[PDB]
Amino acid sequence: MQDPTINPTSISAKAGSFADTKITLTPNGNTFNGISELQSSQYTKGTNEVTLLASYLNTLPENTTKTLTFDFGVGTKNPKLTITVLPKDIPGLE
Secondary structure, eight states, X not given: OOOOEESOSEEEEXXXXXXXXXXXXXXXXXXXXXXXXXXXXXXXXXXXXXXXXHHHHHHXXXXXXXXEEBOXXXXXXXXXXXXXXXXXXXXXXX
């Protein structure tokens, strides 16, 4: 039951097209521990902010639905960043 404001809750891209991306974790009234879904090593947190490394994201298997579950002490509804990793060539019909 906190009021943490961080990156969205879902994204989609090919597994690999996920270049190092630094997210913003607004702690204006909340705290962040880490994203277990991806044993922090997957990313590089920075108190109030956290960036993910294309290494982890790119590592993710086929069309996997990765969820950056930022543990803000309120996992109940904590800001989950459901990132879609699709290394397989299929989507992208611009």
